């Protein structure tokens, strides 16, 4: 027997900036978004779902400097919370 499934589901995209706008990369320290993402994943994967972690990353960019960017989540079809449960 065959059954129907949604063609597109359980996706989340997270981009380094908003549409039209630049994303920054330090020549020796690496991409600002990438570095910030790793730090937040290392700290919050144990206690927060992916959507919440990405929100925290966005908050950390809130106060703009000379090199500003605001990461954005896109085309989200997560129907449940995605916890990484690191260590398990």
């Amino acid at each position: 027997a065959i059954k129907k499934a949604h063609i597109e589901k359980d996706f989340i995209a997270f981009c380094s900036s908003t549409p039209d706008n630049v994303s920054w990369r330090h020549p020796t320290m690496g991409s600002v978004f990438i570095g910030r993402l790793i730090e937040h994943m290392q700290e919050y994967a144990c206690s927060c779902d992916v959507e919440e972690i990405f929100r925290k990353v966005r908050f950390s960019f809130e106060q703009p400097d000379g090199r500003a960017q605001m990461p954005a989540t896109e085309r989200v079809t997560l129907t449940r919370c995605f916890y990484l449960f690191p260590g398990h």
């Binding site: 499934a5 949604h6 063609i7 597109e8 589901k9 359980d10 996706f11 989340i12 995209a13 997270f14 981009c15 380094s16 900036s17 908003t18 549409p19 039209d20 706008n21 630049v22 994303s23 990369r25 330090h26 020549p27 020796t28 320290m29 690496g30 991409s31 978004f33 990438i34 570095g35 993402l37 790793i38 994943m41 290392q42 700290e43 919050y44 994967a45 144990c46 206690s47 779902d49 992916v50 703009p64 500003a68 960017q69 605001m70 896109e74 085309r75 997560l78 449940r80 919370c81 995605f82 916890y83 990484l84 449960f85 690191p86 260590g87 398990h88």
Partner: protein
């Protein structure tokens, strides 16, 4: 300790896992048998666009992080949009996804409003991979093995030329 397989990622304890465990959480497969996969595509050397210095730091950081989280990481470098498409299609066909509970896709390159730049990109002859194509190649139709499983897409790139700011007074 950071000497473990999870490195610098803070561990979730058994008591904290039970406090979280609701019928609104994605199921996690047995650690002993699961075969988690992740893909990193990073473009550093280009034909016409300046060298992305520091990209190796990004590659190192993301590779180690995803491994810490339990994913076996493929790293592919300096690809055209066509090569990225072929690589995505091959990743979607990987048998390990069947015995996996999730996946991560990481894209790092120069970018414009339309999407992500391939190695041969120029203003005269564009070489662009659209985010729309990434979703299509990983959806239930083209990647049935990842049905009902979280697919996390991370993109480092510009999305245009604007500084992304406006002035305001107090």
């Amino acid at each position: 300790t950071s000497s473990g397989s999870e490195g610098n990622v803070k561990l979730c304890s058994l008591e904290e896992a039970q406090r979280i465990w609701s019928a609104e959480i994605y199921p996690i497969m047995d650690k002993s048998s699961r075969t988690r996969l992740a893909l990193i595509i990073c473009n550093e050397e280009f034909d016409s666009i300046p060298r992305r210095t520091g990209a190796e730091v990004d590659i190192t950081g993301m590779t180690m992080l995803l491994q810490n989280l339990g994913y076996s990481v493929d790293v592919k470098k300096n690809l055209t949009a066509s090569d990225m498409t072929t690589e995505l299609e091959a990743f979607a066909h990987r048998p390990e996804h069947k015995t996996s509970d999730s996946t991560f896709l990481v894209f790092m390159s120069h970018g414009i409003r339309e999407g992500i730049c391939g190695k041969k990109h120029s203003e005269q002859v564009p070489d662009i991979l659209q985010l729309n194509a990434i979703f299509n190649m990983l959806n239930t139709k083209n990647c049935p093995s990842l049905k009902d499983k979280p697919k996390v897409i991370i993109i480092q790139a510009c999305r245009g030329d604007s500084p992304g700011v406006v002035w305001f007074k107090d």
